[PDB]
Amino acid sequence: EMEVVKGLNVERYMGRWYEIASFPSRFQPKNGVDTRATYTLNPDGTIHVLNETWSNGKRGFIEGSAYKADPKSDEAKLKVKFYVPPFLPIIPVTGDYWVLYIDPDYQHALIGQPSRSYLWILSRTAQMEEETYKQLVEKAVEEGYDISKLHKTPQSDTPPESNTAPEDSKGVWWFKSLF
Amino acid sequence: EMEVVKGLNVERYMGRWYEIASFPSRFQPKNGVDTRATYTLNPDGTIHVLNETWSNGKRGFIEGSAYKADPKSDEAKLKVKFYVPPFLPIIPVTGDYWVLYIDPDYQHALIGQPSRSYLWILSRTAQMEEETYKQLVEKAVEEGYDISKLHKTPQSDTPPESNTAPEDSKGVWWFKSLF
Amino acid sequence: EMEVVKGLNVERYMGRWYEIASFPSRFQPKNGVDTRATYTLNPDGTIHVLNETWSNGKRGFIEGSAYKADPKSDEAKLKVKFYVPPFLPIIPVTGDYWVLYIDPDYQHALIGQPSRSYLWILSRTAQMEEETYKQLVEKAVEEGYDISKLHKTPQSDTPPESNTAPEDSKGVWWFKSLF
Amino acid sequence: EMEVVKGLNVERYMGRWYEIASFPSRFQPKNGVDTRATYTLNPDGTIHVLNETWSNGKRGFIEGSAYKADPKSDEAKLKVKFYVPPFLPIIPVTGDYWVLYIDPDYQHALIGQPSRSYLWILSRTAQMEEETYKQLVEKAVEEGYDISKLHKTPQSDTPPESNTAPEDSKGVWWFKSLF
Amino acid sequence: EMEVVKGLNVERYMGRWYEIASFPSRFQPKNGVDTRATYTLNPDGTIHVLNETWSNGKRGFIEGSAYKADPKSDEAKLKVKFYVPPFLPIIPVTGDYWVLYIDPDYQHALIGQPSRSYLWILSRTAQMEEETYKQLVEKAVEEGYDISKLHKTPQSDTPPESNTAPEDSKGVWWFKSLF
Amino acid sequence: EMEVVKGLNVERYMGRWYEIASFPSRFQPKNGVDTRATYTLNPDGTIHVLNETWSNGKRGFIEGSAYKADPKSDEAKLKVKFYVPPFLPIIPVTGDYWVLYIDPDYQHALIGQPSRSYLWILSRTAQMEEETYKQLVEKAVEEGYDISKLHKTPQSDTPPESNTAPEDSKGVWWFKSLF
Ligand code: HEM
Ligand code: HEM
Ligand code: HEM
Ligand code: HEM
Numbered sequence A, B, C, D, E, F: 001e002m003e004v005v006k007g008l009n010v011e012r013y014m015g016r017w018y019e020i021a022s023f024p025s026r027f028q029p030k031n032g033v034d035t036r037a038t039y040t041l042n043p044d045g046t047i048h049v050l051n052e053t054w055s056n057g058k059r060g061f062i063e064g065s066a067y068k069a070d071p072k073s074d075e076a077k078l079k080v081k082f083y084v085p086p087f088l089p090i091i092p093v094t095g096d097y098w099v100l101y102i103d104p105d106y107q108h109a110l111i112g113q114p115s116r117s118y119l120w121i122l123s124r125t126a127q128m129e130e131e132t133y134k135q136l137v138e139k140a141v142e143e144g145y146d147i148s149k150l151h152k153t154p155q156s157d158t159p160p161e162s163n164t165a166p167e168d169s170k171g172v173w174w175f176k177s178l179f
């Protein structure tokens, strides 16, 4: 069983996070550069998710949602939900998003899941302090991850520009109006 | 039979209109916030239509066209035409867009259709003067609408930003190049 | 056999090119205005391609790639590759992109292919000097094109604005993650 | 208001019906030959619908469902439900299917709807007796249809063969397993 | 670790198998009746798979493939592979198909997988002898399955008719010709 | 220029033809076995086309149409037309189908096209007499084909069974009802 943070400040968790390192999900592009997530609090309390990465020089992105697995619990156990393929978004896919650690200043976080398949180390700065990085990697070991093949995500000196306003660019609203 | 405005100044009707209230079409998201339309005059005299709304914090939009149902008539009876689903835009859908009323300054308008199914009250300002709102609602009653369940569309204090340049973002041009 | 330029400076060829005139490909919209291409050098040495045109007042675009047909050759024989339809990008299509001529200052170019089906005259300025235009048309005749029905692409006095950062807006990354 | 038959014997209504004449729905092929419906009672009491027609020599078909609009009512007011397009069956469409008349022997029937848009005269025999045909046309007039442009559906001397076992050939089961 | 049968006679395993009971996969319809699989040996030694079930009176099916996870091994560890959705078969999905037990006469079999998620008891007869059924359920317990909620698949007295010749009815051949 | 047969007896050309050998089109499966075409005369004089082949033990097929390139000409220059992909048949593709030779008894034929890209030798019998085969190959050489890599299509001793009644199994009728 995993130790997930309790009492996450959702408002404060919003904004931009850079992926410092990750065991990417199956469909997350594997040799991404400048990978980042933008989180926005929706009016109903769920979270809008914009994940972005640069694959061989081109921005790719996916829009989705995150929400509490059990609203009555104080554990930071979320689910993320996407509609795929992006160009025909009719298949809902979900997965576990557990905040294993976050510092008091909400500057870096360790994201994991009970399967120990995937893992992300996030930072408000694209260039993370090295001792802090090692501490979060060690925290992943405490939770039973094998961090042997964990490689850092390349981050440019300056972050590339993009539109990160919350949007449904693929038209999921139309598919949902059907039902 | 409905009294539609005659001799609409199409050039002057272009630009941004906020939806103050509406009996939304079946696929227009029902609890939209900050709903607006942007109209642009195309070189061939048809109208490019960008409708936008914010559903639970996310921008959703559709691009389409409007044109005169009978070009030889001076009645403001338009058709709107969209290709749906937005993510596979192969089905053309059309409907009636009748300007039932517009003021001399082109600042607010009542849009309806002979089926009396759907209705929109539009304004150049997101915050419409209350007596003017009541007058346009009364004009809808004169045309036989039941305005009992008509609710105002929530509008933020400041309008959210978006790209409203005229675009074919889903690739309808490719589908039309086929034929 | 065609005389293709040798030793193209790929870095220098990048950036924005306006289409002055063209025998458009089958799916390139035929009565385009303000047609332009933006080329960006990818980290792996291939070229990101953004082609844009305005069809009846609306921006339409396609994102693709260009690369050397034979990397060991010094001939500017490229292939362009797109995934179509844009709204369901599962079909890879390729074609020949041969730089038949470019001036020492990289200010205008003649693009063709051995089939003599399609042809593009490109310029860093949307308004090309008339004697230079005639010279490139004559160069196409030297390569066996019939330039009788070649019409110039209309270009506005000022170029319309668009986002030309390199992007995969349709989600090809997801389709490629599958394989 | 329409006079719909009461107390329809659903079991007895099952089987094959030939379309003798019809004001076809928008997507029902318009110059069909040998048009027929096959109805089968499903275990849950709904009706499986297979409609077939021959368009220029080729069998086309659609599979769908019919069920009672109000189960507590004894009026033969059904809804039919299809998932379209057949090759991407993600859009549910429904419409009214009202049995306006059926003879005691369940040998011919008049199908209509309150919109008076569409109409079908059905027969267990592809070759319907002429006086019986005229009587059912007159029954449609009693319900307010304009039968002026009603043309008989061509029926061959012998009915073409097809597989009419109840099937989900397009894979709707997979789309429904998602939800 | 699971005890899988060794030295399966693939030729002899071919033909029709009825599903007597199952913990159905996520997309296998859950309240199926008359569920069966037909296996055919392909020229290259892989196995063509046709799974069929009747959901509320309608035949639904999927075509796929099975093959050896490790050809050099004598363990009956197969993978099954399908392209989904059936109506747009562009997503390859695979899963484990392990023959946990088969009797010397190839008349009944227990199919499972190391995840212990899904389970099938198969029989050449739709009506399986009760003591034999209990023995195979016990064999599943030996492999660590919780058989508490295992319900038998309803099987009609006579099997429904269908076309079980090996076919690619959805056009996967076209998608594969692309690559 | 090619010598195409004049005055083809279309009625007599209908029925089943086995492909004895072929330079397959790009999307025709390349290692097909038991490849055959079935042609049926439609009421409007066009030809329904069912092509079938067995790829690694599974039937794959495509339905399309053939018609006269110039109805006023007596040359057997046809076009074939298909809608692809079969599972989303929205793209019309056409190509040339020229009968280069047919014997007086309508028992074997040579099909080609001016591009000399593709070629088919057809026979009413799956097992073609060897001297007749050589004569038709020589006829292809007379028309400028390089027959060096031409391999015979494997044909079983007995032809596999299939449904060859004329059908629109993918629902093209629905896509065409739209327009
Ligand atoms: C800060 C960076 C990211 C974080 C923290 C993150 C987190 C997650 C998590 C927890 C899941 C659930 C995985 C599972 O258990 O199935 C997931 C799935 C997914 N992610 Fe990411 N992700 C990130 C970046 C990205 C990027 C850059 C992309 C693509 C542009 C992406 C695309 C996807 C997709 C498509 C899925 C669903 C895959 C499926 O259907 O199984 N993610 N992500
Ligand atoms: C000023 C606001 C709007 C106006 C005046 C307006 C007007 C109309 C009209 C007159 C129709 C034809 C309806 C019919 O008779 O079938 C229509 C249809 C449609 N509208 Fe809107 N609309 C607005 C906002 C929106 C928004 C925000 C969306 C979605 C983002 C939207 C999506 C659609 C769609 C998808 C259809 C076609 C539905 C169908 O296929 O039946 N509209 N609109
Ligand atoms: C500077 C302007 C352009 C240049 C130099 C250019 C060049 C090319 C070339 C060389 C090809 C290969 C053609 C072949 O042999 O099959 C091609 C194909 C294609 N182009 Fe363009 N192009 C331009 C503008 C555009 C624009 C504005 C569009 C649409 C927005 C477009 C859409 C396409 C598509 C969809 C294909 C693939 C068509 C197919 O599948 O056959 N192009 N282009
Ligand atoms: C005995 C013959 C038939 C009967 C009684 C019948 C009846 C109906 C009815 C009552 C509707 C609802 C229409 C509405 O109000 O929207 C409908 C819709 C439909 N029918 Fe038929 N039909 C027949 C034949 C066919 C055939 C041969 C086809 C095509 C092969 C077909 C395809 C459709 C489709 C696709 C729809 C839905 C259209 C939409 O989305 O609006 N029907 N049919």
Ligand code: HEM
Residues within 6 Å of the ligand: E017, E018, E019, E025, E026, E027, E028, E029, E032, E035, E036, E037, E051, E052, E053, E060, E061, E062, E080, E082, E084, E093, E094, E095, E096, E097, E111, E113, E118, E120, E122
């Ligand atoms: C004798 C009966 C059956 C057997 C032994 C069987 C076996 C299997 C197995 C071993 C898997 C891999 C599951 C995994 O680990 O992901 C699978 C997946 C699947 N089965 Fe079945 N199956 C049967 C019946 C059916 C039927 C009747 C259907 C639908 C008509 C069906 C549809 C599917 C689909 C769509 C998948 C892939 C699901 C996914 O993408 O995860 N199966 N089957």
Ligand code: HEM
Residues within 6 Å of the ligand: F017, F018, F019, F025, F026, F027, F028, F029, F032, F035, F036, F037, F051, F052, F053, F060, F061, F062, F080, F082, F084, F093, F094, F095, F096, F097, F111, F113, F118, F120, F122
């Ligand atoms: C007697 C056997 C066959 C004959 C005579 C034949 C003939 C032709 C011809 C003349 C074309 C036009 C090619 C072009 O110039 O683009 C064509 C295209 C095509 N054929 Fe065949 N064919 C046969 C078998 C098949 C089979 C077995 C299949 C697949 C099951 C098939 C699938 C296709 C497809 C998909 C196209 C269109 C490809 C494209 O979009 O370019 N054909 N066929």
